[PDB]
Design an enzyme around this catalytic site. Structure first.
Site, PDB file in Angstrom:
ATOM      1  CB  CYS A 153      -0.980  -0.087   1.184  1.00 24.46           C
ATOM      2  SG  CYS A 153      -0.222  -0.513   2.845  1.00 24.46           S
ATOM      3  CB  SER A 154       1.049   4.665   1.197  1.00 22.89           C
ATOM      4  OG  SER A 154       1.996   5.712   0.932  1.00 22.89           O
ATOM      5  N   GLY A 172       3.045  -0.046   3.427  1.00 25.25           N
ATOM      6  CA  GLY A 172       3.195  -1.491   3.497  1.00 25.25           C
ATOM      7  C   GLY A 172       2.935  -2.137   4.856  1.00 25.25           C
ATOM      8  CB  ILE A 173       2.602  -1.439   8.134  1.00 23.33           C
ATOM      9  CG1 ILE A 173       2.281   0.053   8.234  1.00 23.33           C
ATOM     10  CG2 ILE A 173       4.087  -1.648   7.917  1.00 23.33           C
ATOM     11  CD1 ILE A 173       2.976   0.781   9.413  1.00 23.33           C
ATOM     12  N   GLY A 174      -0.459  -1.175   6.849  1.00 18.62           N
ATOM     13  CA  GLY A 174      -1.857  -1.042   7.238  1.00 18.62           C
ATOM     14  C   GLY A 174      -2.839  -1.880   6.434  1.00 18.62           C
ATOM     15  NE  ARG A 175      -5.650   2.054   2.370  1.00 18.47           N
ATOM     16  CZ  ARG A 175      -5.762   3.045   1.485  1.00 18.47           C
ATOM     17  NH1 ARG A 175      -5.517   2.807   0.207  1.00 18.47           N
ATOM     18  NH2 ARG A 175      -6.096   4.276   1.892  1.00 18.47           N
ATOM     19  CB  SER A 176       0.193  -4.301   3.245  1.00 18.45           C
ATOM     20  OG  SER A 176       0.406  -3.544   2.039  1.00 18.45           O
ATOM     21  CD  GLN A 183      -0.737   2.403   8.632  1.00 15.61           C
ATOM     22  OE1 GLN A 183      -1.505   2.287   7.665  1.00 15.61           O
ATOM     23  NE2 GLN A 183       0.197   3.322   8.682  1.00 15.61           N
TER      24      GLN A 183
END
Ligand code: JGG
Ligand code: JGG
Length: 282
Positions: free
Chosen positions: A215-216, A218-222, A262
């Protein structure tokens, strides 16, 4: 506790923020010394999101092997994922070098190039068949083969050529295009449908290298994507599906990359997705 009734118990008691802060307190802390070297400053999008040294993906290069990307290896579920930031102008060549070297079949993208009026990642794939991209720093060529645009996501077929050896491979780009600029989706139905489309392609299967998901940061949506996939797979494998503990799975994944999920809203959305997904599987 089971999942669906633990869920209602947190809703009625309004304690999602407290549950999420417990996870943050218990999460692993490992060194990320390579990420913080001065020569790598323009390889990181956000100064507070870095790969751990023990699980980072290394580029096959002797000058500088660094990319902001982590290998998440889920042993019981027998799935692996690479989670990475959205590529930067000076890392698009590194990104495709990683896809090549790790033998990935699919790339999963959960953001739009522009959100909230600002750039969230580089335009790192070609938009027209006849206008291919060449990455001179890593000696790769990338061509758009076909594109299928649906209401919630787009699937693209891409050809990646290693110009040193003239070998070619087919890469599938799965682009979820409708995550809202603020918050999380109201229903998990389109996100689950998207997950099942990635699965059906073979991109998550052991005969290929790990899927690359971003994603932006790489931790939330991902994080939501791999958490939901792994939890649903464990519910299929085990004799007692109610034994799957989504908080424990998330803490295991956070041994391999910091910060996954997140916000408390993303945590609640992950519960919702696994709950609804478990009914459709049967
Ligand atoms: N693949 C996978 C996978 C990832 C994380 C977990 C976390 N759970 C866990 O530690 N336990 C303790 C012992 O069995 C019950 C659940 C489990 C499986
Ligand atoms: N192997 C494979 C594979 C190739 C391509 C896709 C995506 N679909 C696509 O390009 N089109 C063209 C427009 O109408 C039909 C669908 C998925 C899997």
């Amino acid at each position: 506790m089971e999942m669906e009734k633990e869920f209602e118990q947190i809703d009625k008691s309004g304690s999602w923020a407290a549950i999420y802060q417990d996870i943050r307190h218990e999460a692993s802390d490992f060194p990320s010394r390579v990420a913080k070297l001065p020569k790598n400053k323009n390889r990181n999008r956000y100064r507070d999101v870095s790969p751990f040294d023990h699980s980072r993906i290394k580029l096959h290069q002797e000058d500088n092997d660094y990319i902001n990307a982590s290998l998440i290896k889920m042993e019981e579920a027998q799935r692996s994922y690479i989670l990475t930031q959205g590529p930067l102008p000076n890392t698009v060549g590194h990104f495709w070098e990683m896809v090549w070297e790790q033998k990935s079949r699919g790339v999963v993208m959960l953001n739009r190039v522009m959100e909230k009026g600002s750039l969230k990642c580089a335009q790192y794939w070609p938009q027209k068949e006849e206008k291919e991209m060449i990455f001179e720093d890593t000696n790769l060529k990338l061509t758009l083969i076909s594109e299928d645009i649906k209401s919630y996501y787009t699937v693209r077929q891409l050809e990646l050529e290693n110009l040193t050896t003239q070998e070619t491979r087919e890469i599938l780009h799965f682009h979820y295009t409708t995550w809202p600029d603020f918050g999380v989706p109201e229903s998990p139905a389109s996100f689950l449908n998207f997950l099942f489309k990635v699965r059906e392609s073979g991109s998550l299967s052991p005969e290929h290298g790990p899927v690359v998901v971003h994603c932006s940061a790489g931790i939330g949506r991902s994080g939501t994507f791999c958490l939901a996939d792994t939890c649903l797979l464990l519910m299929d494998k085990r004799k007692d599906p109610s034994s799957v503990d989504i908080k424990k799975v998330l803490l295991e994944m956070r041994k391999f990359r910091m910060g996954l999920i997140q916000t408390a809203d993303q945590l609640r959305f992950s519960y919702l997705a696994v709950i609804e997904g478990a009914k459709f599987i049967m």
